[PDB]
Amino acid sequence: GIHFGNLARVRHIITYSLSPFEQRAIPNIFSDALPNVWRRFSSQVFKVAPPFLGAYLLYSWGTQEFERLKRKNPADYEN
Amino acid sequence: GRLMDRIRKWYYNAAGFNKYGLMRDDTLYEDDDVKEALKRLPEDLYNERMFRIKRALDLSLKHRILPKEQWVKYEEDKPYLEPYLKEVIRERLEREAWNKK
Amino acid sequence: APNIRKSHPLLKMINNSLIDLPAPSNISAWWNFGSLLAVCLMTQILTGLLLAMHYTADTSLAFSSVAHTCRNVQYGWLIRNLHANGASFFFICIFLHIGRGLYYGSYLYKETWNTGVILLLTLMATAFVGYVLPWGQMSFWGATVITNLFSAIPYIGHTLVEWAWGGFSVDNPTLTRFFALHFLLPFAIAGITIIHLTFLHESGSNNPLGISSDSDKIPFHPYYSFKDILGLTLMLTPFLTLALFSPNLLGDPENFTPANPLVTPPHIKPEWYFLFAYAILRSIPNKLGGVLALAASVLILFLIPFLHKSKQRTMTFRPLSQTLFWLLVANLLILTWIGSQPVEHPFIIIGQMASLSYFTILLILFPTIGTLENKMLNY
Amino acid sequence: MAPNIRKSHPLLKMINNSLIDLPAPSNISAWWNFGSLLAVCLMTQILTGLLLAMHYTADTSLAFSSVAHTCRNVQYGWLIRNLHANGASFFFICIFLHIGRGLYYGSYL
Amino acid sequence: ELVDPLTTIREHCEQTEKCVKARERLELCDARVSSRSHTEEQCTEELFDFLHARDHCVAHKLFNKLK
Amino acid sequence: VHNDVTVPDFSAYRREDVMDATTSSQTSSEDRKGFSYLVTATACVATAY
Amino acid sequence: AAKNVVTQFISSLSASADVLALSKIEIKLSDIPEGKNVAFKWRGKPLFVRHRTQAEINQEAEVDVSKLRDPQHDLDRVKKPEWVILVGVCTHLGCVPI
Amino acid sequence: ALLRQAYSALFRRTSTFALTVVLGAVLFERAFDQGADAIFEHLNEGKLWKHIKHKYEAS
Amino acid sequence: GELELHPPAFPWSHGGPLSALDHSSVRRGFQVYKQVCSACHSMDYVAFRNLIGVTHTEAEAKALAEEVEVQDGPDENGELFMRPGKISDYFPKPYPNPEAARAANNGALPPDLSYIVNARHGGEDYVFSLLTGYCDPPAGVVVREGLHYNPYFPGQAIGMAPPIYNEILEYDDGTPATMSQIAKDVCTFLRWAAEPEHDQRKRMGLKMLLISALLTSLLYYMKRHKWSVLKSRKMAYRPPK
Numbered sequence A: 001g002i003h004f005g006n007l008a009r010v011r012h013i014i015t016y017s018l019s020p021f022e023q024r025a026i027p028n029i030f031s032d033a034l035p036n037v038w039r040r041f042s043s044q045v046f047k048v049a050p051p052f053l054g055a056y057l058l059y060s061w062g063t064q065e066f067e068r069l070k071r072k073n074p075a076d077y078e079n
Numbered sequence B: 001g002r003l004m005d006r007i008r009k010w011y012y013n014a015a016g017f018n019k020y021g022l023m024r025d026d027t028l029y030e031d032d033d034v035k036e037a038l039k040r041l042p043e044d045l046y047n048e049r050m051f052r053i054k055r056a057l058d059l060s061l062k063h064r065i066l067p068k069e070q071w072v073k074y075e076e077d078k079p080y081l082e083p084y085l086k087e088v089i090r091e092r093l094e095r096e097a098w099n100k101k
Numbered sequence C: 001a002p003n004i005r006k007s008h009p010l011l012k013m014i015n016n017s018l019i020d021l022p023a024p025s026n027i028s029a030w031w032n033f034g035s036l037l038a039v040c041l042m043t044q045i046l047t048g049l050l051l052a053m054h055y056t057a058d059t060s061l062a063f064s065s066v067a068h069t070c071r072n073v074q075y076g077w078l079i080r081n082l083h084a085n086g087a088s089f090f091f092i093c094i095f096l097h098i099g100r101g102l103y104y105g106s107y108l109y110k111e112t113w114n115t116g117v118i119l120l121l122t123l124m125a126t127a128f129v130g131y132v133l134p135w136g137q138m139s140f141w142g143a144t145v146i147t148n149l150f151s152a153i154p155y156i157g158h159t160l161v162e163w164a165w166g167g168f169s170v171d172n173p174t175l176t177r178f179f180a181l182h183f184l185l186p187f188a189i190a191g192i193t194i195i196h197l198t199f200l201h202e203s204g205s206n207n208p209l210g211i212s213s214d215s216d217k218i219p220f221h222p223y224y225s226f227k228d229i230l231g232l233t234l235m236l237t238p239f240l241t242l243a244l245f246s247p248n249l250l251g252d253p254e255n256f257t258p259a260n261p262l263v264t265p266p267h268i269k270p271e272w273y274f275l276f277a278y279a280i281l282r283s284i285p286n287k288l289g290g291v292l293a294l295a296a297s298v299l300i301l302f303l304i305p306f307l308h309k310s311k312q313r314t315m316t317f318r319p320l321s322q323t324l325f326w327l328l329v330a331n332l333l334i335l336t337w338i339g340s341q342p343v344e345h346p347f348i349i350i351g352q353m354a355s356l357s358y359f360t361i362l363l364i365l366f367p368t369i370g371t372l373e374n375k376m377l378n379y
Numbered sequence D: 001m002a003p004n005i006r007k008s009h010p011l012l013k014m015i016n017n018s019l020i021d022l023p024a025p026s027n028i029s030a031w032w033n034f035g036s037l038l039a040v041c042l043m044t045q046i047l048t049g050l051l052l053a054m055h056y057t058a059d060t061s062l063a064f065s066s067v068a069h070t071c072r073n074v075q076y077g078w079l080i081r082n083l084h085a086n087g088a089s090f091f092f093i094c095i096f097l098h099i100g101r102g103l104y105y106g107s108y109l
Numbered sequence E: 001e002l003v004d005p006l007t008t009i010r011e012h013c014e015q016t017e018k019c020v021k022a023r024e025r026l027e028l029c030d031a032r033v034s035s036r037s038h039t040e041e042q043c044t045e046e047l048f049d050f051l052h053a054r055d056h057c058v059a060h061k062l063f064n065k066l067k
Numbered sequence F: 001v002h003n004d005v006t007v008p009d010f011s012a013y014r015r016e017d018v019m020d021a022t023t024s025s026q027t028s029s030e031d032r033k034g035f036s037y038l039v040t041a042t043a044c045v046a047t048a049y
Numbered sequence G: 001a002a003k004n005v006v007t008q009f010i011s012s013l014s015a016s017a018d019v020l021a022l023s024k025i026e027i028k029l030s031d032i033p034e035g036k037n038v039a040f041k042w043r044g045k046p047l048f049v050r051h052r053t054q055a056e057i058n059q060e061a062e063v064d065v066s067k068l069r070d071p072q073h074d075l076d077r078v079k080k081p082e083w084v085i086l087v088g089v090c091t092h093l094g095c096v097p098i
Numbered sequence H: 001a002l003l004r005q006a007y008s009a010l011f012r013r014t015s016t017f018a019l020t021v022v023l024g025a026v027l028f029e030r031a032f033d034q035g036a037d038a039i040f041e042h043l044n045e046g047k048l049w050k051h052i053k054h055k056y057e058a059s
Numbered sequence I: 001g002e003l004e005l006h007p008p009a010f011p012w013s014h015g016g017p018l019s020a021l022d023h024s025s026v027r028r029g030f031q032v033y034k035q036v037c038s039a040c041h042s043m044d045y046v047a048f049r050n051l052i053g054v055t056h057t058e059a060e061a062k063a064l065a066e067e068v069e070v071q072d073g074p075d076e077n078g079e080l081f082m083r084p085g086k087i088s089d090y091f092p093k094p095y096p097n098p099e100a101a102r103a104a105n106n107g108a109l110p111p112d113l114s115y116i117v118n119a120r121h122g123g124e125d126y127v128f129s130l131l132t133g134y135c136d137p138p139a140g141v142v143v144r145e146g147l148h149y150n151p152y153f154p155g156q157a158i159g160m161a162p163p164i165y166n167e168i169l170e171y172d173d174g175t176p177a178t179m180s181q182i183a184k185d186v187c188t189f190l191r192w193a194a195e196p197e198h199d200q201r202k203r204m205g206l207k208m209l210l211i212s213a214l215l216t217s218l219l220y221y222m223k224r225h226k227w228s229v230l231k232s233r234k235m236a237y238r239p240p241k
């Protein structure tokens, strides 16, 4: 059952942390937060958007095309 | 030729594992062969790989990456495990061929 | 001794899986669905029992009993809504859960993944029979179609249909056995979910980076208990907004018409969470092929593990794989769209493409690009 | 590593851990057989029960007759209903003796 | 005696740009179909395009006049 | 040697009332704790509702 | 013992005895004017009875009977060329054909 | 200092904290429920049977 | 044919997520259903008691109830028999079975309106457009004898004749009984009929959103708080020299 203590062998790593009460829950909302939100957004939009944007069109086309084929062709009764 | 040689440098930057401070070898998935390799690693190399990883995990939880100035450069990437891994797999293949023999 | 949190035969378990459970320090929101899925199961079961208390498994009474539940039973309408919409958020969540798994190579945890597939499949069957209970036009004809799928099996087949209906046509014997079946399955789901988490705990959660997190684990509590609660509340808003403001949004209005054994509505479409598969099956203009395609469209999940060629575990560092991935997601989004459209041009051909597309990205492109990417890493 | 797959496998490790390698006193008597019978009763009831629930109808106006139909029209419905009805009894017969044994041999400790 | 605001506004709306052209397109169809004997065409489409444009307009203010 | 180890600077994160390294953080403690616990208490009240 | 208990239980699922087996149904060919199809409840699922105008009767007897999934000639299917009678149930997965 | 007083007198002791949540909900409930309805009924004046009522009532 | 006219979107006073039903108009619609539609349409899931406190006073409802003779029994001799209506009874079925109804409507079967707006895409927008959208067939379109033209109805040849026209009744509240006014009231009624919870459903939604906001917020703060320990966590690799 118990896993904490076996996990892995680690040496020479020091860490420093502060009580949740000595710091801010959401700090540097502008100087740090948002800037990264953008960073991340930026770096993934060209990977994600393409296939979706693509399908999007396929939708509109297929939709419009199906609808076009609804309308009547006057050339069928000009006789 | 020097085609995939620059292709490689491109991919290396595209992959992006260096923005975390990891070497190509750090990101290797730990199957049997790799775990065996990791075992043979001299201590310094092993302790270093650990820290690199632990730092990357901290970066991930933080949703941050290293400053562009600390990203590993394609040509400075050390394949510290690659060779060990080769041997390990080499060693295994032999046993295998031998046992079917 | 010392503490009764680690010694007690029972608490030792709650503590062993929801308090001292070591978890990667970096798992993201895409790891919140596991519990949401769990919460859905609980929520469904609970509202379900509540509803089952006022239901009547009988063709001549089913439809109206549900009506009475909504119109006469205090908050009956609310409960039915939460149950109807819960079903959807169950699928929404399960779908994202599956996605995350594919993107981050969680499927490398074979037993956890496989049982996961069983869960999806069971959830599917569960939701099916359940939908047949209000006994509206959709309920009836859906029942008719889905059970009929098995007629595709050589020799036997039909004989299996007889069982499914308890007759030679959908009728009361079917309704009552379906109510039983629907009452039962949720629990087989909860049960299997225990096996799921059990196999999972053998290895512990995987993480975005797809590399060992032993160098940095954290107690589930309070890190993920807190994260999870937050996650729940986020999923809760849309679910309730939908439930309280646009109740029938995700539902077909054709099912407000009591089942008519003699008339299949001109416009009959599968519940949204079935559309993608529905679409794939319509593509093959052959009975057996379409079924096999349908079967394959879901069963293929079992192969994913044997199609992993990447030397890396996740797609975090595989830009090509990442695109192929999102392509697949849109591919499905397309198949879903198609499912809602009539069997006509250009829809038919588009569907067939998407279908052909789907199996290809999974059986061929992915393993291929993975191999390709390995070489690009000079491996 | 673990040699046999009977003691290592996450699931078998359990069937083996409680129904195969489970250490048991060499002298437990017949009064120790009810635990499993009880378990078998539970299983049998659930099973025959599901089978009956497939033909029941929870409605004052139909309940009595649905059961009659189960017995009169459903193949072996009569048998299933009987097994379910009498199973209930053997369930109590067994549970009562189980309780007895416990009291006599101080299992309540 | 009374006047259904529905008619009042249906008129006003038929004055509208689209309606007019739609109405016209329709009249044209009706004409040739009503004449040409032993034909095969219909004027559903035009009637709909007309209706669609008309009522869309109707449904935009009709309620203001209703209680 | 362990003498060459310093705890980094946490001003970018410290709460305004414990930013000055020469002021007893204790006086502002009751508030720092009172506030966070208030959020929690409130959440409890909401959920309770 | 096992084979028999499974047998019995397995068959508790099959159709019950109250599942009859009923007769015919008469239909006045006058209620069905030419050029129309009408559905009648029967043995459970629908039942079609369609009065075919010879405008159709031709087409149905004039098609590649070799290019048919289930090859048959409109003639050996019905009896009176102005009437076509079949069970209104799609052979695919059972819906009612419109 | 509310935060200090609050902490010092409500949030510190696990008991007083609990009682405060109970007490809280109570007051919060009344307040919320009333105001919520107020907001709803306002946004829907003269449309509720509450509003129409008197026309077919007593005197 | 393979072409259909979808209805427009009228601004029903209850269309909005926080917009209740106009009970006055619902009261009206009732009358329309009672005095006009009920002659061929059953509303099996509603009872006179349902009106109480919604559109009518208890007395009014009881009254409306008694106006109908209901069949009860058996009695002492095992005889059926009539009796006045109780607020517990449901709205009277115009026919004892579809066969009879169809018989009295050219074989056409008027559907039960209890859940009508939800049984049709478009709901009141569709029901409304249909009731008023009656008109003559376009060129080339022949409407079979018995059926009437209505572009909004699928197939355009419906079996129901225009049920309403100006002053087909007189709203005892003084509202001008214009045809569309009527359609607007009965449609509003058909919405309430299909979902009385409608109003409460929405009032809850309001409370829901408020709490959901307050709570999602407080929990975002809480999640962050605890996690800060990790977010700001700094580490370093100080190997031995």
Ligand code: HEC
Binding pocket: I032, I033, I036, I037, I038, I039, I040, I041, I105, I108, I109, I110, I111, I116, I120, I127, I153, I157, I158, I159, I160, I161, I163, I164, I186
């Ligand atoms: C003389 C009987 C009669 C009256 C009175 C009448 N209807 Fe109907 N109604 C019918 C018939 C017949 C149909 C079936 C038409 C069909 O499906 O071919 C019908 C159908 C309908 C339908 C739509 C069916 C569909 O498929 O779209 C609605 C909605 C409807 N009526 C509403 C009303 C309302 C509201 C009123 C009162 C304002 C009303 N009717 C009054 C006979 C009537």
Ligand code: HEM
Binding pocket: C030, C031, C032, C033, C034, C035, C036, C037, C038, C041, C094, C097, C098, C101, C104, C105, C106, C107, C109, C112, C113, C114, C115, C116, C117, C119, C120, C123, C189, C193, C196, C197, C200, C204, C205, C206, C207, C301
């Ligand atoms: C009732 C259905 C299901 C429930 C309630 C459920 C629940 C869970 C839970 C609680 C977790 C842990 C947290 C997380 O990572 O999300 C988990 C993990 C996992 N589940 Fe599921 N699951 C279900 C179905 C499935 C399905 C359909 C699949 C895929 C075919 C699956 C595959 C996995 C895998 C691979 C993991 C590993 C997560 C990781 O990468 O660390 N699950 N599941």
Ligand code: HEM
Binding pocket: C041, C044, C045, C046, C047, C048, C049, C050, C051, C052, C053, C055, C066, C080, C083, C084, C087, C090, C123, C126, C127, C128, C130, C131, C132, C133, C134, C182, C183, C184, C185, C186, C187, C189, C251
């Ligand atoms: C796996 C979890 C569950 C899922 C996915 C689920 C899904 C569904 C679905 C889709 C329907 C039709 C909803 C509709 O009316 O549109 C339904 C109906 C129903 N379910 Fe479930 N259900 C679940 C659990 C349960 C359980 C455990 C019970 C009770 C023992 C239950 C009782 C009912 C009842 C009474 C109905 C029929 C009446 C109604 O439609 O509300 N369900 N369920």
Ligand code: HEM
Binding pocket: D042, D045, D046, D047, D048, D049, D050, D051, D052, D053, D054, D056, D067, D081, D084, D085, D088, D091
């Ligand atoms: C704890 C195990 C169970 C016990 C002790 C038990 C006991 C009983 C008893 C004493 C009756 C009345 C029998 C009679 O007709 O004389 C009964 C009836 C019934 N039980 Fe159970 N039962 C069990 C499990 C189940 C389950 C799990 C189901 C199905 C989900 C089920 C379904 C029914 C049905 C349909 C009836 C009513 C019709 C009948 O009497 O045969 N039972 N059960």
Ligand SMILES: C/C=C(C)/C=C/C=C/[C@H](OC)[C@@H](C)[C@@H](OC)[C@@H](C)CCc1oc2c(O)c(OC)cc(OC)c2c(=O)c1C
Binding pocket: C121, C122, C124, C125, C128, C129, C138, C141, C142, C143, C145, C146, C147, C164, C181, C268, C269, C270, C271, C274, C277, C278, C281, C294, C295, C298
């Ligand atoms: C007694 C219990 C039984 C027999 C259980 C059977 C379980 C089967 C499968 O679950 C594993 C099945 C639900 C799953 O197939 C993988 C679905 C994706 C199939 C989806 C599906 O839905 C339809 C539907 O909903 C309809 O009505 C609104 C109508 C339909 O066509 C006219 C369909 C349909 O054509 C398909 C393919």
